[PDB]
Paper text:
The particles harbour 10-separate genome segments and comprise two principle protein layers, the innermost composed of 120 copies of protein λ1 clamped together by 150 copies of σ2 (viral polymerases, λ3, are attached inside adjacent to the icosahedral fivefold axes). The array of μ1 and σ3 is interrupted at the fivefold axes by pentameric λ2 turrets which enzymatically cap the mRNA transcripts produced by the polymerase on egress from the particle. Here we demonstrate that vitrification of infected cells followed by cryo-focussed ion beam (cryo-FIB) milling and cryo-electron tomography (cryo-ET) allows high resolution reconstruction of assembly intermediates of a mammalian reovirus, allowing atomic models to be constructed which throw light on some of these fundamental questions.
The star shaped icosahedral particles comprise 120 major proteins with additional density features on the outside. For the AB interface the rotation of the iris blades again radically alters the interface towards the fivefold axes, in this case through an unusual ratchet mechanism. If the A molecule is considered fixed then the change corresponds to a 45° rotation around a pivot helix in B, with the effect that a bundle of helices surrounding the pivot helix rotate by a register of one helix (~12 Å), analogous to gears slipping by one tooth. The 120 copies of λ1 are decorated with additional density at 120 sites. The density is poorly defined and only the region fairly close to the λ1 shell is seen, so it is not possible to unambiguously assign it to a particular protein however the overlap between the positions of these features and the attachment points of σ2 in the virus suggests that they are σ27. There are no significant sites of unexplained density in the interior of the λ1 layer of the SLP that might be attributed to the λ3 polymerase.
Residue numbers in the entry:
A (entry chain C): 217 to 562, 571 to 1275
B (entry chain B): 410 to 505
C (entry chain B): 266 to 313
The structure:
């Protein structure tokens, strides 16, 4: 099972398997290079993020301590531990077991403990104090927290086997067996109803009251293996929110699911019939192959890729290098320039050229690089060093310059540069100056002007543009060369590529299924001969040789030659023209076949723009991309794209090496092309990473849509988006602030998927407020092409809205305290909590004589016996006593000063001040009621923790719960909340039979409605008001075949 | 940015002053090690000297020439007696 | 141009209430705070 790619060849007993490098057995096998997150996971542990914590057990009358069978006794174990007070605690996937970790788990501390870290998980992380969070960052933190919870819950629950039960209550009933130990503890949790309750306690009474039928497996898939079915429905404690999110994730997987037969056909198409994958496969009942995708996602991803590339030449060189290595071992053709030397059998012009050649170097990267550039036509430019051209424009009499000219002429058709023909023509004119005359339309450009200066169409000469305009008499050799170039100028080609049904193609500036080539290609024929003038390159070489012979015929261009080298020169040129190189033949047939095979092989889709060999007006000048919608107007800023002025990155390669290779090509004598290609391709195909790249791209696309939606959700934009937590505090963040929060979300996502590769970095690069991505390019004549893709929606956003509404309903359960609190020391024997104290004791907001103070309100202080009364906001000076309303923002502005003014009032003052809080995180401390309590020191510490930048979670001191009368001692507390937030407490004092008055909490019937209420149907929901802690759930077992191919011949 | 701690006309005036008109107004950049050719920001300053510097910049821009142009001119002036060369790359903003 | 302080404000006094004493806070100010202050031209006074 270690193998993730399994390939078996039909023509050899040598199966080749591709696996993740993390495996311990990479023996003679391909491995998966792309960094890819494992979206699909199987859960071996409970998917539970919340566990109730019981503060102190309460039990009263009890029928039995252990079930009696023979001399043995079955022990009674409560899945819920007994408590005077019990509250659930947050630890996402606390009971889960899996090999892969999302690394996004959230643990919230128990009520006696501080959970501030989760609240401060985002912007509040940088706090020296464990407690304390910045308020305006709270909304962003909550949103990110929900996002992390969802990412952490991206798992699939693996279907598992069941067992007949021998416990008496469900003896013979089938219980799914949890792994190894605690299974009975796990059984008690899944089937508390199974656990007996002979003892009397609120838990026991509740268990006795529970319905017997609402337990065990609700239903199973008819197909099953042993005790395990493909899917099953069972009754157990669970959280609906996670199940619903997983259902949405599963639905995405179901849409993505792809079929094996389609894969076999696609693999055959990619092989181009060189190799074919076989599927005589026994069907997997749960076989799962999620490979459904849209080319629009690919287009968005490629736009992201270009922005991410940000012109990194460093990234490009390695891909080209790996491709060249592949071409070097993917081509059976052998290059022998030394064979050319032996055929020459060599003051010698041949010796001069041989010394210039310096053939000792054994590296052939440039030719392979040239092919790769042809593949990426739009983003690649081939350029030639002027030094490759003859020095000083060459010399009419220079034989070495003649060698340079011949090599240059050979590689000139090869150059992708559009104005390269103009440059070669200019180069010939430069050598011809003083022998043939060329008119110049522009004074700025001279006949001797360096051709490289003419790098653009607008600089193409009108005399150059019309051959007839130039006098044939003025430059007859040049006139002939122009006619010959028109007669034999090379033809570029376009070839069909890609499979639309699955991978498809995202091509926009080019046809999606068509691959552009700068070289016309013809059908491969193994029997083809070495000599072929029909091949464009062979014809070009022959014409160039004859033209040069004609030029050197009179020796007018080379006066001062005592002996005629015309005969010798003609012979050497004739041998060169007639050289039986197979390199052109290979480029004509073998090169196209290899390129066609590698096109699917390419991990990154090449960028190309339409080829216009002679269409100067329709030659595109540049490509523009936009992050904003057309209507919006925004500042243009410095960007990476500027570093490449050319849309195609300019590349200079060694002309001599390429020309020598072109003159020196031979295949193996007994080579079988089909055999060689199938043998090389089979391991290479077994090495495919395209699926991994596609998966990463799809994740990036989903992330982009989710990000734009979230940006609208947490920012003020024209588009309407539902935000029900605007009450949650937030300031108006600058675009940069939102971007930084977004970058933290991105880092979280990468760690969640364990991504070792950069993700959406161009998206995090800048311009976070980008209305719309759009791209266009224009021609020299000025015609332009604009491509804009359409946004596909993100499931994450919909799940987020649902969770947001759930949080708004359950924020008290969520652990954040909405509302404000009032400051008043109170000592009493009543149990009223700060959440639920006597209301009359709190001065209500709509109360007369309460004091609000103006920011500039006149302030008076008394020293050395002075007595001051503060002038009020109304302007009436009053003593520092009574009920006052203080805005928190004013307090943060003057926290130290306010504390100092009321420090005496705070410690012993009866003056009561209300600071408006709206919402805040809170901290809970249990205390002993029968001992004296003073929070004044504690209140001082909390106030000191309060700071102008941000405030600490409110510290609450609460008594230990009691089911029986207990003695009490005075307790002093100055913190009074304005509302009850005790809904979080699961139960109180299970032992007590009944309560005449005051607070009492029991196990919630609604959360256990299916067990508590027989009438209620199992699938009936109380959401969002009531979330059942225990519910019937569906667990399914599926099997996923990763890339697998059986390679054979075509029928 | 100064704390008000006063009812001074200055304190009232600061409260009156627009909160959002602060920080860089705009810049010609975003990439790391990619300096903005120009940047706009709200700040305490005097408009007249800024206007003078802008006119000075306008005259300098009026005389500015591109490096490729310089290479061609120098090569022509050398007349092949000597050769000067420039590499091919986008303007990085060098005033000529 | 730089503002120069001409006449400062008068403080401190026993009668003056000091919950308020602004001088007690002593916050650095963008402009001179004084009974009389006038702008002055100092070309490149802060320039480097």
């Amino acid at each position: 099972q270690r193998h993730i790619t399994e390939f078996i060849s039909s023509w050899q007993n040598h199966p080749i398997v591709q696996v993740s490098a993390d495996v311990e057995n990479k023996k003679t096998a391909q491995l998966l290079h792309a960094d890819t997150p494992r979206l699909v996971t199987w859960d071996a542990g409970l998917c539970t993020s919340f566990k109730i914590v019981p503060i102190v057990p309460a039990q009263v009358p009890q029928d039995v301590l252990a079930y009696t069978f023979f001399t043995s006794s079955y022990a009674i174990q409560s899945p819920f531990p007994e408590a005077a007070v019990s509250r659930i605690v947050v630890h996402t996937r606390w009971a889960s077991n899996v090999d892969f970790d999302r690394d996004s788990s959230v643990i919230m501390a128990p009520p006696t403990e501080n959970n501030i870290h989760l609240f401060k998980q985002l912007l509040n992380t940088e706090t020296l104090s464990v407690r304390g969070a910045n308020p305006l960052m709270f909304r962003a933190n909550v949103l990110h927290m929900l996002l992390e919870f969802v990412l952490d819950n991206l798992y699939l629950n693996r279907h598992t086997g069941f067992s007949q039960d021998h416990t008496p209550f469900t003896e013979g009933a089938n219980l799914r067996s949890l792994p190894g130990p605690d299974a009975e503890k796990w059984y008690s949790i899944m089937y508390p109803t199974r656990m007996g309750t002979p003892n009397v306690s609120k838990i026991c009474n509740f268990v006795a009251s529970c319905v017997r039928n609402r337990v065990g497996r609700f239903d199973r898939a008819q197909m099953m293996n042993g005790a395990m079915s493909e899917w099953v429905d069972v009754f157990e404690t669970s959280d609906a929110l996670t199940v619903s999110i997983r259902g949405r994730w599963m639905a995405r997987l179901a849409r993505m699911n792809i079929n094996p037969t389609e894969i076999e056909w696609a693999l055959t198409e990619c092989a181009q019939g060189y190799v074919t994958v076989t599927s005589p496969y026994a069907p997997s009942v749960n076989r799962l192959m999620p490979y459904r995708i849209s080319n629009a996602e690919r287009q968005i991803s490629q736009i992201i890729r270009i922005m991410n590339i940000g012109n990194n030449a460093t990234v490009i060189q390695p891909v080209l290098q790996d491709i060249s290595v592949l071409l070097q071992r993917i081509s059976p053709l052998q290059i022998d320039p030394t064979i050319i030397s032996n055929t020459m059998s060599t003051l010698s012009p041949a010796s001069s050229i041989l010394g210039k050649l310096r053939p000792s170097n054994s590296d052939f990267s440039s030719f392979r690089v040239a092919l790769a550039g042809w593949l990426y036509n739009g983003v690649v430019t081939t350029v030639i060093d002027d030094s490759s051209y003859p020095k000083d424009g060459g010399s009419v009499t220079s034989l070495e310059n003649l060698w340079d000219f011949f090599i240059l002429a050979l590689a000139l058709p090869l150059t992708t540069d559009p104005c390269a023909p103009v440059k070669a023509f200019m180069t010939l004119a430069n050598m011809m100056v003083g022998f043939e005359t060329i008119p110049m339309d522009n004074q700025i450009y001279t006949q001797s002007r360096r051709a490289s200066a003419f790098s653009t169409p607008h600089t193409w000469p009108r005399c150059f543009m019309n051959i007839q305009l130039i006098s044939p008499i003025d430059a007859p050799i040049l006139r002939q060369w122009a006619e010959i170039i028109h007669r034999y100028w090379p033809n570029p080609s376009q070839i069909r590529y890609g499979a639309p049904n699955v991978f498809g193609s995202a091509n926009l500036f080019t046809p999606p299924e068509v691959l552009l080539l700068p070289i016309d290609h013809q059908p491969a024929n193994v029997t083809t001969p070495t000599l072929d003038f029909t091949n464009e390159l062979t014809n070009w070489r022959a014409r160039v040789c004859e033209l040069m012979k004609n030029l050197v015929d009179n020796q007018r261009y080379q006066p001062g030659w005592t002996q005629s080298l015309v005969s010798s020169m003609r012979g050497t040129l004739d041998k060169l023209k007639l050289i039986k190189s197979m390199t052109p033949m290979y480029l004509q047939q073998l090169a196209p076949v290899e390129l066609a095979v590698i096109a699917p092989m390419l991990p990154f889709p090449p960028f190309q723009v339409p080829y216009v060999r002679l269409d100067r007006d329709r030659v595109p000048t540049m490509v523009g991309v936009t992050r904003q919608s057309r209507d919006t107007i925004t500042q243009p800023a410095l960007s990476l794209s500027t570093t490449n002025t050319t849309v195609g990155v300019p590349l200079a390669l060694d002309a001599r090496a390429i020309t020598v290779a072109l003159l020196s090509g031979k295949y193996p004598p007994d080579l079988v092309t089909n055999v060689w290609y199938a043998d090389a391709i089979y391991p290479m195909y077994a090495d495919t990473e395209v699926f991994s790249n596609l998966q990463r791209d799809m994740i990036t696309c989903e992330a982009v849509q989710t990000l734009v939606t979230l940006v609208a959700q947490i920012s003020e934009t024209q588009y309407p988006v539902d935000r029900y937590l605007d009450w949650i505090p937030s300031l108006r963040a600058s675009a940069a602030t939102a971007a930084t929060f977004a970058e933290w979300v991105n880092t979280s996502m990468k760690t969640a998927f364990d991504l070792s590769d950069m993700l959406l970095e161009p998206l995090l690069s800048g311009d976070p407020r980008m209305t719309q991505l759009a791209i266009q390019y224009q021609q020299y004549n000025g015609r332009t092409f604009n491509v804009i893709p359409e946004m596909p929606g993100s499931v994450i956003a919909d799940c987020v809205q649902l969770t947001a509404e759930v949080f708004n309903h359950e924020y008290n359960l969520f652990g954040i305290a909405r509302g404000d609190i009032i400051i008043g020391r109170v000592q009493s024997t009543h149990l009223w909590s700060p959440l639920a104290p006597p209301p009359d004791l709190v001065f209500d907001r709509d109360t007369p004589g309460v004091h609000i103070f103006g920011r500039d309100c006149r302030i008076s202080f008394g020293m050395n016996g002075a007595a001051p009364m503060i002038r009020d906001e109304t302007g009436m000076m009053v003593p520092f006593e009574g009920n006052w309303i203080f805005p928190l923002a004013l307090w943060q502005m003057n926290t130290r000063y306010f504390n100092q003014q009321f420090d005496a009032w705070i410690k012993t003052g009866e003056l009561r001040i209300r600071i408006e809080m709206g919402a805040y995180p809170y901290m809970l401390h249990y205390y002993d009621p029968r001992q004296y309590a003073n929070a004044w020191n504690l209140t001082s510490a909390w106030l000191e923790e309060i700071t102008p930048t941000s405030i600490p979670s409110v510290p609450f001191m609460v008594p230990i719960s009691s089911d029986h009368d207990i003695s009490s001692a005075p307790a002093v507390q100055y913190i009074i909340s304005t509302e009850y937030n005790d809904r979080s407490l699961f139960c109180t004092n299970s032992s007590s039979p009944q309560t005449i008055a005051g607070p009492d909490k029991h196990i919630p019937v609604e959360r256990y409605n299916i067990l508590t209420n027989p009438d209620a149907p199992p699938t009936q929901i109380q959401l969002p008001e009531v979330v059942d802690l225990y519910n019937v759930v569906t667990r399914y077992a599926y099997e996923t075949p990763p890339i697998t191919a059986v390679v054979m011949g075509v029928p």
